[model samples]
Target: MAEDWLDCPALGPGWKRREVFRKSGATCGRSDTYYQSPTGDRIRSKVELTRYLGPACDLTLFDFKQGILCYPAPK
Candidate 1:
């Protein structure tokens, strides 16, 4: 909720999730989400996450942007 970093279990552990709401913009109604690994690496996309986490990262139920396991699209 809001802009805060939380723990994510979908990616196992030691993975932090963060989501921020956009205040004002030309498009409006937009936000950004990212993740931080235990090693301090940032992640924002599944493609790059895959690279960071490795081949057997097991992200089948994990969403990079929303930072969730599955279902419940980002609001």
Candidate 2:
């Protein structure tokens, strides 16, 4: 598994994120990504992360796949 966790301070201190590319599997070609909280929560999606956030952070610009902000795409 090729992966590396990096510091993600978007929500505050002690937050980290990582992305792993799947080689051969049902989800092949899809990158697996997640975030780790200080409380040891492995958040895999914005919904899951928001469930534990309780409006403490902003996710409008959050890109869960890479754990970073993204440029909005045009319709």
Candidate 3:
């Protein structure tokens, strides 16, 4: 079974999943998931992740109801 590693979309193509974690408690307020890109950049938003994939690329957010959403990165 897959462990619950927070519900965040997975990066595809140019970007890869370097690391991931869930933030919560007093410092975080609410639990949020974050990912590290290939360029050692920490991102938690669709736009940020997309930009990391490539320059001026299109993005589409889809709900797979899973922690990973393996969306295609811009070419």
Candidate 4:
């Protein structure tokens, strides 16, 4: 589990140490790289031609004008 902070341009300019985790048991490129925003939102994604993520994961081709954003995970 690699914990670190990331600069999220979409979220704003706040240097906070967010937890960045590589989905465990990743197989067949089904998992994704994920992190938590300062507002407690979950941001996730996989590697793609234009879109990209480390340790390559599944790519869901869909219509979107923004990044993959989700609600906070159950704590």
lDDT of each: 0.66, 0.67, 0.46, 0.36
Per TM-score, the best of the predicted structures is 2
Runs off by more than 4 Å, candidate 1: 1-3, 22-28, 58-62, 69-75
Higher lDDT: candidate 1 or 4?
1
* C-alpha-based local distance difference test score of model 1: 0.66
- For every model shown, the clashing-pair count is 0, 0, 0, 1
Off by over 4 Å in 3: 1-9, 13-31, 55-59, 63-75
Candidate numbers sorted by TM-score from highest down = 2, 1, 3, 4
Report lDDT (Cα) of residue 58, candidate 1: 49
Residue 42 of model 2 has an lDDT of: 82
* Candidate 3 TM-score versus the reference: 0.39
**TM-scores for candidates 1 onward, in order:** 0.59, 0.59, 0.39, 0.25
Q: Which ten residues in a row have the lowest lDDT in candidate 2?
A: 66-75
> What is the RMSD, in Å, between candidate 2 and the native fold over all Cα?
5.3
- Candidate 1 TM-score, C-alpha based: 0.59
lDDT of 2 by residue, 1-75 (tens): 436777775666676766667435565467777777778788877657766776776555776664655446725
